[PDB]
Design an enzyme around this catalytic site. Structure first.
Site, mmCIF file in Angstrom:
data_model
loop_
_atom_site.group_PDB
_atom_site.id
_atom_site.type_symbol
_atom_site.label_atom_id
_atom_site.label_comp_id
_atom_site.label_asym_id
_atom_site.label_seq_id
_atom_site.Cartn_x
_atom_site.Cartn_y
_atom_site.Cartn_z
ATOM 1 N N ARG A 194 0.837 -1.192 0.000
ATOM 2 C CA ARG A 194 0.000 0.000 0.000
ATOM 3 C C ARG A 194 0.875 1.246 0.000
ATOM 4 O O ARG A 194 1.866 1.319 0.733
ATOM 5 C CB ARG A 194 -0.920 0.010 1.227
ATOM 6 C CG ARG A 194 -1.781 1.255 1.374
ATOM 7 C CD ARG A 194 -2.645 1.143 2.631
ATOM 8 N NE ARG A 194 -3.333 2.394 2.937
ATOM 9 C CZ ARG A 194 -2.995 3.212 3.934
ATOM 10 N NH1 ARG A 194 -1.982 2.920 4.741
ATOM 11 N NH2 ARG A 194 -3.673 4.333 4.123
ATOM 12 N N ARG A 246 -6.090 19.166 7.035
ATOM 13 C CA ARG A 246 -4.814 19.071 7.735
ATOM 14 C C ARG A 246 -4.405 20.444 8.249
ATOM 15 O O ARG A 246 -4.556 21.449 7.545
ATOM 16 C CB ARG A 246 -3.708 18.519 6.821
ATOM 17 C CG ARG A 246 -3.935 17.086 6.347
ATOM 18 C CD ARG A 246 -3.388 16.081 7.349
ATOM 19 N NE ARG A 246 -3.117 14.781 6.738
ATOM 20 N N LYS A 287 -13.244 3.379 0.392
ATOM 21 C CA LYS A 287 -12.939 3.426 1.821
ATOM 22 C C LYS A 287 -14.124 4.036 2.549
ATOM 23 O O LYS A 287 -14.552 5.148 2.228
ATOM 24 C CB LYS A 287 -11.668 4.226 2.103
ATOM 25 C CG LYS A 287 -10.406 3.524 1.620
ATOM 26 C CD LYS A 287 -9.205 4.461 1.606
ATOM 27 C CE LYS A 287 -9.017 5.155 2.958
ATOM 28 N NZ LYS A 287 -7.568 5.429 3.202
ATOM 29 N N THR A 323 -6.520 -0.570 9.862
ATOM 30 C CA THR A 323 -6.168 0.508 10.788
ATOM 31 C C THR A 323 -6.167 0.047 12.234
ATOM 32 O O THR A 323 -7.199 -0.387 12.773
ATOM 33 C CB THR A 323 -7.081 1.714 10.610
ATOM 34 O OG1 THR A 323 -7.242 1.971 9.215
ATOM 35 C CG2 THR A 323 -6.452 2.956 11.272
HETATM 36 O O1 LIG Z 1 -7.704 6.124 5.906
HETATM 37 C C1 LIG Z 1 -7.711 5.147 6.687
HETATM 38 O O2 LIG Z 1 -7.089 4.093 6.434
HETATM 39 C C2 LIG Z 1 -8.468 5.243 7.931
HETATM 40 O O3 LIG Z 1 -9.087 6.299 8.185
HETATM 41 O O4 LIG Z 1 -8.479 4.265 8.711
HETATM 42 K K LIG Z 2 -5.387 8.476 3.131
HETATM 43 MG MG LIG Z 3 -8.318 8.000 6.660
#
Ligand SMILES: O=C([O-])C(=O)[O-]
Ligand SMILES: [K+]
Ligand SMILES: [Mg+2]
Ligand SMILES: O=C([O-])C(=O)[O-]
Ligand SMILES: O=C([O-])C(=O)[O-]
Ligand SMILES: O=C([O-])C(=O)[O-]
Ligand SMILES: [K+]
Ligand SMILES: [K+]
Ligand SMILES: [K+]
Ligand SMILES: [Mg+2]
Ligand SMILES: [Mg+2]
Lengths: 510, 407, 510, 507
Positions: free
Chosen positions: D53, D100, D246, D304
């Site tokens: 990744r 950010r 995601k 994560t």
């Molecule tokens: O972006 C990611 O991988 C998250 O927020 O867990």
């Molecule tokens: K990201």
């Molecule tokens: Mg994230």
């Protein structure tokens, strides 16, 4: 079979949702004077008969030889078109250790036994044709050595009951309990006595030897009580008869209690309900029936529900509601074959009886709760390294996944097709074979439509396989099991000969 | 039962395992010349009849005397409430017999039914909801509590079945005309469909006609007849019926005894493990405390293998609610309302018992006396014995369940 | 639980569906310097603490007596309103057969760093007991030379430092640093592949367990139980005076998992993952957890999942994603309680840790697939003559059928409430007792909200029952469990004393 | 799976019962400073990495181009030998609508109750401190209100909006700590209007096409069109690139079904997700998504903080070991490492641990129920490949075969087997390199790249590939000669589907 519960599955049964063309349950018809003619046998076949049963309780070897010839003549009358040709099996059903009365005296036609009257039973051959209301002869020479005072003795389909009051070296004095009209040569049942007649008598041996000589496909062995009985039948058939299937008839209490050892030694079972419902209380027969079908289903061995399924059609052209129920419920129980006895041997409506079984069997098969059945057959099956077995269950799963029009199986011994039938696909199994005996014995297993290939063996194994697969395609289309638009399953082997089935294809019908 | 699968349940069926002495399925007998006399009715009760059916398809004076013979035979045992078995009375209409939903002749029979205090009506050839409504509108306010049982005998009645079940108190699968009206090979589908939906809704269903046909002339039934009675119980039919077999045949007592024996063996063979799971899964969440108590008691009866579930009830409703969940154990329903006790026979597993004792002024003492009545009934009838565990349901609602020893 | 499959049940989980007010899983909080003040304990009770755990691996009897006093002071600060009073249990956790290192050298940095491949000498010479450093390491297991073998592995500090034994010697062993890192003082030592001969119950443990009886603790968490006989020694020490103290066996080594069935002799189990995932490979712990929780559910005995469930909250005000998942999955596994150790004994956010375990437990409880769980607990539990068991399952079925606000259970010993909890109702179980210890021990069982009735015993049994029932009713409304016109299940007995629960009522909330 | 109940299955779990060799669950490693060198990337493949990744939240194309080149270097270091060769995929993780903070003044401590002004004036953009924080979300003042909560740096620091301005907001510190540079900002409940596909995203996404990446992990997908936008940018040059949406905010969860319908797969992105929605609800979202993706037959990644403590330690916590096991039990096709492999001190230990736990977990799956429910929820088909696949998995259990060998060009056929979750490994033989790398997205697919030239006679080519799989499985310890295996091939050449299953012994 989409419902999540059996109860919901019951609620969704719909009398206006028509079934599929293919009828999976085999129909065994007893041949007699009502159905012995070549003309009638052709219509029997057309109506749906798959196996001809020859009851060797009556008739000479010459008589049965002639019936067998009429059956084969009717059957080969369709042989000119192998695509529509339907194999027909021949079954020998032994006499076994039957007990019968003698002839009513010529004076008489039938005598009335009335409740509470006395009746003497003697073994003196002077009365064997002079039976009447005071003296009854029967042919079991040692009936006195096996009964005691108070014993019950049953006569003529268990419809007359007698209680022993005196027990003599030569005679018995009985009190008529349930009375009725008594005719000649009626069957006698002695439940709860230890009947010492042989399982395979001398007449049975000659009959069985004759069976091998006439090339019968299977034996229905009467009054099997233990595994050694099955082994005697097997020994008699011997090396020449080693390919004939032995179907043990379970007809007495001992037969039920030792069922597992009988099942293990037999090729199949018949639930012979006529005698069974006299040897054990009539209220218990359905228990014995569902037990035996369950265990045969679990063993993957053929089971036949038999006797009085459409009894009233002996004299009437439409069955009772109980009789329609009983045929449906035999199929729902899981029977591989349903059978007809008096209804086709002697009745006024042989063709009507065959057609009704055909109609009910097909309604019942669409009512099967395949979701639960396939799930449970799989859970109770062992894990094995058998390629044919893993291929058979794969094909059945796939047939459900695409609601295939059929599962086509090339088989020489029939085993590969049997292994598919054991998991109970909804779709018909078209078993292509060149072995004519295999095509006839295929009828013992639910769902197997055997078709007989008479084309020469093709030198290239691949081209031979394609030839027989294409043959099954045409059979399927001609009988209306599927059309060019549909998907089917095809089971084939990697080399010639038995034991090599290991290939499942999912193919559009061309 | 126990086995993990229905298939293994079947494989374990054992002919030599005798069943529990209580027979849960009701037996409905058509009374006719073979059976109308006082002396044989007494023997039909002893052999197990619970409901005398009277076919108005054929004079009121004739039926009034048959009805009088039934009550005479019934109360012939009333000397003893511990052994008294209530018997109900059912009027079956002729309907359109060779059309009007309800005839003029049917309106006279129905009105004659109310005056004769019949417990239930079997309504022939019900084809839609409105047909039942016409029958209940004719029964009126006097026969308000007469249970109405729509006979499904035709294609439309099958087709409009859900309508009819909702508009009825119960259903009869009337297979004799149903089998000529629709193809004979489809009747098992209609029979099993209708029993399933009645079991789902908690409404009584009768399986009727030709069950032991050959016993009209013979002292033993065919193998297919024995199978038909057994499978109807395994379907879930609250009651099984005899028509010609007891009305006109040569062996009416034999027919009754055989339905009793077969029903009992079949009840022993029901796969309770699955049935109770599916009835529960298929029945809604309730706010009714009697409903919650009823399924709680059935669950308790399986956990402790209770000899019975004793239900004190007046309208019978409390006891019906237990029966829809299909315990193995007999439901002993104790009641003072004789009509409730007669009508209870339409629900599988309810053995009604009629208390004739006067009300005790203290509700507690009164409850306990009726419960003790059930205890004596079950000891005498062999349902249970001293020191066994039973379930007791008591009270505007039966909301209390107790797990008690048998004294 | 309305979906017909587990997969479809998962698919239906909904983060926008809020959960019921009552949290069923108990929260056990280890008490230390971060949490032993009366004021902080009060907030911990308001935050959801049900059991105070006292780790006797450290501290003096005087120290622990003070903690215990403070726990009771904070608990009794709420006693003036019995409707809202939450009972709070006290648990003694034994030291057991611990092995610890000594104190680092004073001159060096508080932590010495060990590097991969370096040599490290382990000694029993007490002149080094407070002079440990990167060259020489004291520890307190005087017999470690007898039971350690050359080549075996020694683990130090939550299994983070590993050593390979090279040479054995007299009062020493010479090892080589396999996995290095910083080493501090008094770190735990594990010898997974040794036949460690420390006593199951040491003299210190005997002194500690007698002190637990003297202080009236509710339960013992017995460390490093390996066999049934270990449990029996603990139970002998507690003796007649402590006969009512629940023994919870901590499973934290291979033999304990191996002999689990004989150990579960106990009143309940703790899955003590901290030492467990050092004594056995860490990848294998979840297997051990799920096994033990399942066998404890099937036995009806309490099971605690413990250690590192929210470890990062020692230093951080919110947990890692792995930690949210571990808590939820402990509850879905079937755990009766979840536990916190360093998160509440010594960390910066003890209150936040308790509230998070409360929040997660509640969400996971609404996600249990009760349809499958109830069906299977019933099927696996025996048939019984016990009236109380039949009454309990009947109450849980009824509570599902009316979606009841609660199951109210009157109980003296606890057991009638325990028997209900064993079948895992969704509804909370309000267990009304006059016995304070029963009220405190109830927290060991999933779903039991114990309430301590302070009203005097009424002369007649029926009057006394109705009082306690009404007390439960007021508890449920005040705490938001149900409201008037809702329906609840009420379990009561026919006679005072333990064992007579028989009676089940379905009653509207007044 | 031999127990009649799940409860009994739990009770029969046995720590002394060793697992099978093949690990079915894919492992996705975030590559970064700790794991960038060719040398350790090699040891990462040997340790079990299947997907590399690359997180485009940070770093330049040139940095990532060098990362991608070092990935391909370690991977092809084993290419000499296709029997053992393990393909490695390359995934591009978009930045997305990230908020950010700026550069501080280099850390700055901050205390609860204090004040903190946040400004959009780009002057203070590099002068962030305890009094003024600068962030890049230009409409922030539109989409928050007085009382809103603002979180910084993985949700650790929290603020509450007390005054609103035009280019500013006055906030009170709810949870302080050591603030730093360029930290991440979350606004739960705030209806953020930033574009799903950004300008830099289009550049990054176009950069992925030219670098020949196998899959995009598209950040913060909220709706179906967002996936459509990422797909349109990838265009026809990158039509073969799998888009994994995601799910990391409340609208992603609410709109999951239409996002699933539009995507090639899903990642359960628990980092942001557990800030956007309450942390106690993440497990419900994860189980919901893995279940629906299992139902639909599409890959699902759990990501994560699975082994977060291993960033600094050589062993994981008990909670982390359990989290990895349960993700596998939930149904996840792959699990993921982020900081554990990108910046931490023990990236090889983390990869190895995820390998060890996943294996033990797959051995713990209650296949009896899982297979029964996947069939009941999957529709009746007319596709020969689909019915063949479920039939092959059924045969798989019946003979407990060593493997299911699938020949496949696009991968599809192997994906259709995988969705029915056989226990046995699926060895997918392909000559397509992209197919072989993408197959790691699907639990159970052990992909192998056949390099031998085509054979003229089709059935000669089929056998060639088949016997490649046999060596592969015999060499990797999946089966031994004499073992039974299942082989899925075509029937007629050029038929286009995989409708043939054979039950054969290993030669
Ligand atoms: O972006 C990611 O991988 C998250 O927020 O867990
Ligand atoms: K990201
Ligand atoms: Mg994230
Ligand atoms: O022999 C038979 O077939 C019978 O008795 O049913
Ligand atoms: O009328 C009836 O009862 C019938 O047809 O069954
Ligand atoms: O003692 C403990 O709690 C442990 O080892 O986890
Ligand atoms: K015969
Ligand atoms: K015959
Ligand atoms: K400890
Ligand atoms: Mg016979
Ligand atoms: Mg420990």
């Amino acid at each position: 079979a989409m419902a999540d519960t059996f109860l919901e599955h019951m609620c969704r049964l719909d009398i206006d949702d028509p079934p599929i063309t293919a009828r999976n349950t085999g129909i065994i018809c007893t041949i007699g004077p009502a159905s012995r003619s070549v003309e009638t046998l052709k219509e029997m076949i057309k109506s749906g008969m798959n196996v001809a049963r020859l009851n060797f309780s009556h008739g000479t070897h010459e008589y049965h030889a002639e019936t067998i010839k009429n059956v084969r003549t009717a059957t080969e009358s369709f042989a000119s078109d192998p695509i529509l040709y339907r194999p027909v099996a021949v079954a020998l059903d032994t006499k076994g250790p039957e007990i019968r009365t003698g002839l009513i005296k010529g004076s008489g036609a039938e005598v009335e036994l009335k409740k509470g009257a006395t009746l003497k039973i003697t073994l003196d051959n002077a009365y064997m044709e002079k039976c009447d209301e005071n003296i009854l002869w029967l042919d079991y020479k040692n009936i006195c050595k096996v009964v005691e005072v108070g014993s019950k003795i049953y006569v003529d389909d268990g419809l007359i009951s007698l209680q022993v009051k005196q027990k003599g070296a030569d005679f018995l004095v009985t009190e008529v309990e349930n009375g009725g009209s008594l005719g000649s040569k009626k069957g006698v049942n002695l439940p709860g006595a230890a009947v010492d007649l042989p399982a395979v008598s001398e007449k049975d041996i000659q009959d069985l030897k004759f069976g091998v000589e006439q090339d019968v496909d299977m034996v229905f062995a009467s009054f099997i009580r233990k595994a050694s009985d099955v082994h005697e039948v097997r020994k008699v058939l011997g090396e020449k008869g080693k390919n004939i299937k032995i179907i043990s008839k379970i007809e007495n209490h001992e037969g039920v209690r030792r069922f597992d050892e009988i099942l293990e030694a037999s090729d199949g079972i018949m639930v012979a309900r006529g005698d069974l419902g006299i040897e054990i209380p009539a209220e218990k027969v359905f228990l014995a029936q569902k037990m035996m079908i369950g265990r045969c289903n679990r063993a993957g061995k053929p089971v036949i529900c038999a006797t009085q399924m459409l009894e009233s059609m002996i004299k009437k052209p439409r069955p009772t509601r109980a009789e329609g129920s009983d045929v449906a419920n035999a199929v729902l129980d899981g029977a591989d074959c349903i059978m007809l006895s008096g209804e086709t041997a002697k009745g006024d409506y042989p063709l009507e009886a065959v057609r009704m079984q055909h109609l009910i069997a097909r309604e019942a098969e669409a009512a099967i709760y395949h979701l639960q059945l396939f799930e449970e057959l799989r859970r109770l099956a062992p894990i094995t390294s058998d390629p044919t077995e893993a291929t058979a269950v794969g094909a059945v799963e796939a047939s459900f996944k695409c609601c295939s029009g059929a599962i086509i199986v090339l088989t020489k011994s029939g085993r590969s097709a049997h292994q598919v039938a054991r998991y109970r696909p909804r779709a018909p199994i078209i078993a292509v074979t060149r072995n004519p005996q295999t095509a006839r014995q295929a009828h013992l297993y639910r769902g197997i439509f055997p078709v007989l290939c008479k084309d020469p063996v093709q030198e290239a194994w691949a081209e031979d396989v394609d030839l027989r697969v294409n043959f099954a395609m045409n059979v399927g289309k001609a009988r209306g099991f599927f059309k060019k638009g549909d998907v089917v399953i095809v089971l084939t082997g990697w080399r010639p000969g038995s034991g090599f089935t290991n290939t499942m294809r999912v193919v559009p019908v061309p």
